[PDB]
Amino acid sequence: KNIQVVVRCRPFNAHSIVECDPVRKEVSVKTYTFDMVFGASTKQIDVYRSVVCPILDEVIMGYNCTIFAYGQTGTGKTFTMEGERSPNEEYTWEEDPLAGIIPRTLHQIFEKLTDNGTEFSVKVSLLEIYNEELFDLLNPSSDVSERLQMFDDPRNKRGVIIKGLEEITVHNKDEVYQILEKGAAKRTTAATLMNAYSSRSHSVFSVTIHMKVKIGKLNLVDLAGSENNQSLLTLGRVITALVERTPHVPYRESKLTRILQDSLGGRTRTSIIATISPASLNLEETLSTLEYAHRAKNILNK
Amino acid sequence: KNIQVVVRCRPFNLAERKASAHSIVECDPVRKEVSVRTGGLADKSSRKTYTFDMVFGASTKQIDVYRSVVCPILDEVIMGYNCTIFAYGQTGTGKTFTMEGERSPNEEYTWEEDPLAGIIPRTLHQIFEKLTDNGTEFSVKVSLLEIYNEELFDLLNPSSDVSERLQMFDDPRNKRGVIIKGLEEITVHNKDEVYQILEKGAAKRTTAATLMNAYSSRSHSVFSVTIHMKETTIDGEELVKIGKLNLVDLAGSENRAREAGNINQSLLTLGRVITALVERTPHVPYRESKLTRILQDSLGGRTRTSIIATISPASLNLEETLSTLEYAHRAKNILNKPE
Amino acid sequence: KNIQVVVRCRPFNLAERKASAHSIVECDPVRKEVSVRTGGLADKSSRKTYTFDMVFGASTKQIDVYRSVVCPILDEVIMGYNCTIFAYGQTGTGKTFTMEGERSPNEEYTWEEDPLAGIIPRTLHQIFEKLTDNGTEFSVKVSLLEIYNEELFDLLNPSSDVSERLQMFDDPRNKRGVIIKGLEEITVHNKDEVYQILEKGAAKRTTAATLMNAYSSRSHSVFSVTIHMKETEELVKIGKLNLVDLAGSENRAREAGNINQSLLTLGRVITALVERTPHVPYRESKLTRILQDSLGGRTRTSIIATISPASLNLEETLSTLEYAHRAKNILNKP
Ligand SMILES: Cc1ccc(C(=O)N(CCCN)[C@@H](c2nc3cc(Cl)ccc3c(=O)n2Cc2ccccc2)C(C)C)cc1
Ligand SMILES: Cc1ccc(C(=O)N(CCCN)[C@@H](c2nc3cc(Cl)ccc3c(=O)n2Cc2ccccc2)C(C)C)cc1
Ligand SMILES: Cc1ccc(C(=O)N(CCCN)[C@@H](c2nc3cc(Cl)ccc3c(=O)n2Cc2ccccc2)C(C)C)cc1
Ligand SMILES: Nc1ncnc2c1ncn2[C@@H]1O[C@H](COP(=O)(O)OP(=O)(O)O)[C@@H](O)[C@H]1O
Ligand SMILES: Nc1ncnc2c1ncn2[C@@H]1O[C@H](COP(=O)(O)OP(=O)(O)O)[C@@H](O)[C@H]1O
Ligand SMILES: Nc1ncnc2c1ncn2[C@@H]1O[C@H](COP(=O)(O)OP(=O)(O)O)[C@@H](O)[C@H]1O
Ligand SMILES: [Cl-]
Ligand SMILES: [Cl-]
Ligand SMILES: [Mg+2]
Secondary structure, three states, X not given: OOEEEEEEEOOOOOOOOOOEEOOOOEEEXXXXXXXXXXXXXXXXXXXXXXXXXXXXXXXXXXXXXXXXXXXXXXXXXXXHHOEOOOHHHOOOOOOOOOEOHHHHHHHHHHHHHHHHOOOEEEEEEEEEEEOOEXXXXXXXXXXXXXXXXXXXXXOEEEEEEEEOOOOEEOOOHHHHHHHHHHHHHHHHHHHHHOOOOOOOOEEEEEEEEEXXXXXXXXXXXXXXXXXXXXXXXXXXHHHHHHHHOOOOOOHHHOHHHXXXXXXXXXXXXXXXXXXXXOOHHHHXXXXXXXXXXXXXXXXXXX | OOEEEEEEEOOOOXXXXXXXXXXXXXXXXXXXXXXXXXXXXXXXXXXXEEEOOEEEOOOOOHHHHHHHHHHHHHHHXXXXXXXXXXXXXXXXXXXXXXXOEOOOOOOOOOOOOOOOEOHHHHHHHHHHHHHHHOOOEEEEEXXXXXXXXXEEEEOOOOOOOOOOOEEEEEEOOEEEEEEEEOOOOEEEOOHHHHHHHHHHHHHHHHHHHHHOOOHHHHEEEEEEEEEEEEEOOOOOOOEEEEEEEEEEEOOOOOOOHHHHHHHHHHHHXXXXXXXXXXXXXXXXXXXXXXXXXXXXXXXXXXXXXXXXXXXXXXXXXXXXXXXXXXXXXXXXXXOOOOO | OOEEEXXXXXXXXXXXXXXXXXXXXXXXXXXXXXXXXXXXXXXXXOEEEEEOOEEEOOOOOHHHHHHHHHHHHHXXXXXXXXXXXXXXXXXXXXXXXXXXXXXXXXXXXXXXXXXXXXHHHHHHHHHHHHHHHOOOOEEXXXXXXXXXXXXXXXXXXXXXXXXXXXXXXXXXXXXXXXEEOOOOOEEEOOHHHHHHHHHHHHHHHHHHHHHOOOOXXXXXXXXXXXXXXXXXXXXXXXXXXEEEEOOOOOOOOHHHHHHHHHHHHHHHHHHHHHOOOOOOOHHHOHHHHHHHHHHOOOOOEEEEEEXXXXXXXXXXXHHHHHHHHHHOOOOOOO
């Protein structure tokens, strides 16, 4: 109920081995049923208003939520969470139809919170988990190799502290672009230095809201490629345990699930977007991802 | 009070006639009520009643709509305010007839005199007449923007391609305002020039319709007149004023289905904005749709806003008709008075 | 340098013979040099000489300015780059003649074929002939902006009052672009629509001169052509060309102080671009903010400095050349 699992299939770029029916909420390659399904034609704005938008209402209530993008490389994970700029500087990013979830989300927050007329405060942070180590993508001064320290939080027994993690204040929607642009530059230095790692790292973006005093928080997680590990294995199980309420959820077995435990249980909503390729050679992988999403929340066909 | 919600019922069409539909809708102008028979061909007893600021039954004349709804607003606009009038409701119920109106067949009338002329031509004629009459020094600009499938188009630019999309930006001076880059505001010097500007706009609109799927029922249309006035009196006050009036013909309320889905969203947003402004709620979600964002500077601030909600009499429309009246009633909730 | 500076001296005309004047200016096209007799019998031997990228003397035809200046630039625009060509100099030294040109007496020719046409008409014709020949799909927009007393006006809007001022803003989509709220950009589908559009603009320019005194000598004129070109992977390339007829270089005295300001900072900006200074003061005038899109980048920029040969004009003439040399400093040959 509070954990939605949706699939989105991307456009190619001819042999189509998949198929998706939105009304019957089914993906056929072999057939699975989900909370929602998006076919190749599907558009960034659609994904946003169906999956993300309801979750952000909750976040604005003072809840803490998380949205994952899961899948292999080439399926639209970075496309879905981040997006691209349309050609010829035709659009502002707030209007760009090719803008992914993170931009739409930050735009939406300033739209909704400005409409409300109340004093509010916005904060973002972005961290990468690579080989069970945590790195801060928004700290301007730190070298790209500095690991962060995290430990359990004496005040919060759902929580941890990530020590020194930069929380950047976004004063207005405009400033958001500079912030994440530097982050992208840093992250491009980290990938060069360490083992061509963009497919191997987990991105945790976090926006936190202070409404003057209720606090919402949303974490937008772009996981490392699901093709073949541990952080992926552990999350399935944390998800499995949260679906059925089998006690002692194994949060402690990965950095990801420890960092997230606070949101992953509490009064919350959690979604994961499983991304798949239509193309011929991806087939083993598509099946893993649907199986994985199937394992996550098990929904029998109709 | 500055927000008025009214309903206008049209007569039957041929289709409802040939189709043996029966009238389910009753209008009582004096009590400002609309009743609908909700019980189909089985029950004649079931009725739902709504009350609004005014109700125009099927015999209502264009001029009647103009005098009650528009003139009080036009007075305000000439005084230097910025106001808005919407036509809301199901495709084929009269939004265009109301806003634009129609030529009387067999020639006869000038458009200035034609009893079938709607709000837009009557409004423009009166602007020129009223200001020419008090000796105001003034100028008039008109623009027409279509919001279609999430995109912006300009119908009064005669040179540009119907496929040309326009971009929206914040207005740096004003948090309530936007700028639509390249939207033409055409200066019209008299009532003839506005006839020819709109005659061309209609042709360009037909062209666009032919090009794009379900075009009139799927677009919002924003017609805007801006008036710059300077009133000068020897040995007296010199007043400068800027009036603005938006006449908005909304997309069909009946409801790709993502296209039909997205229309439905901006409609609900508009509804929420109106509800909030009647209620004086602090959260007015202006920024949740293009339409409401574009109209925010009119709707915010000191104005008059009216909605004309149009419906069919026919039984074959029951669901849509009820949905429309629920929408109107949700925008401004007036309590039924005892019978 | 993709900044080309050239100089054009027009012929000694009737009135200057009626003024019984003396031609003081000499152009070496081959040496690319201009020299002026500076002394008026004070020496009368005395000479100033300047070197440039090209120099066009009194006998230069319109087609020669087009070939050497405009063509290379057009080519770059059609590749998708923004460029700017300026005419700079004293009033009645030939800027309008150069940018616009004149109709041939008679009815001898059509403007398309008229040997007296200036840069603007030759440029539009060529854009239409070239992209049509190219066979791919394209569209052409034009706008004409006047900057008079640091206010913006739209000369191509038929309907609007010649006194309506426009407001400008940064374009949030890019660093160098601006938005001039309400500036019309008229789509032109063929060469014939161009003539109509510019003729209406001429009247509106004429009626606006009748109002605000000075004008064409006191205002900057910015003419922009924007071309959208479709390719195939399917792509749009976008070129833009600005043709800028600057306010007179000579110099109420208030606008005069200010015209000089922009012209001055325009100079500052050009120098900054030729010899690279870290911060180019684009923002220090309306004109340079507006031209910023076409100055930064891979761009061919060109300035055509116009001058009179006559003695009556010495002072102005030397400033102009000095202005041009200051903007890009080259060195004399043997
Ligand atoms: C509309 C749009 C979409 C994407 C971009 C873009 O390519 N990037 C760079 C990386 C995208 N793969 C933007 C971007 N960068 C990110 C960097 C990191 Cl480390 C994490 C997330 C993002 C991200 O979401 N974006 C997209 C974006 C665009 C505008 C505003 C916020 C976010 C930045 C120029 C701001 C630009 C404009
Ligand atoms: C008395 C009368 C009423 C309607 C018309 C009419 O049919 N049209 C075309 C649209 C029909 N739906 C007129 C008209 N066209 C418009 C085009 C656009 Cl894009 C937007 C609004 C209008 C519009 O309001 N009208 C009505 C009108 C009539 C006379 C003067 C001004 C406007 C034009 C001939 C001027 C003609 C005369
Ligand atoms: C071959 C030719 C050259 C000049 C003209 C001419 O005199 N004008 C008027 C302005 C003269 N200074 C033409 C013209 N007008 C302009 C008006 C403005 Cl506001 C800005 C530029 C021009 C301009 O460049 N021209 C020349 C021209 C001629 C034909 C086609 C395009 C441009 C118009 C009849 C089209 C006519 C024919
Ligand atoms: N829904 C979609 N619509 C259009 N293109 C898509 C979609 N999903 C993915 N793509 C394409 O995927 C490419 C980017 O792949 P990306 O998502 O960056 O890989 P990864 O998930 O490994 O980071 C882009 O060329 C983009 O066009
Ligand atoms: N109140 C009315 N009186 C007479 N004719 C009307 C009335 N309302 C609508 N019509 C006619 O009914 C048809 C549909 O109305 P129209 O306003 O054009 O549709 P829409 O609501 O889709 O814009 C048109 O022929 C119009 O002329
Ligand atoms: N290169 C030239 N060849 C022939 N005539 C010229 C030349 N340059 C200028 N003229 C003449 O000088 C006159 C006045 O200068 P003009 O062209 O109006 O420039 P400005 O706008 O600076 O006055 C024009 O009518 C034109 O005939
Ligand atoms: Cl604009
Ligand atoms: Cl030709
Ligand atoms: Mg309509």
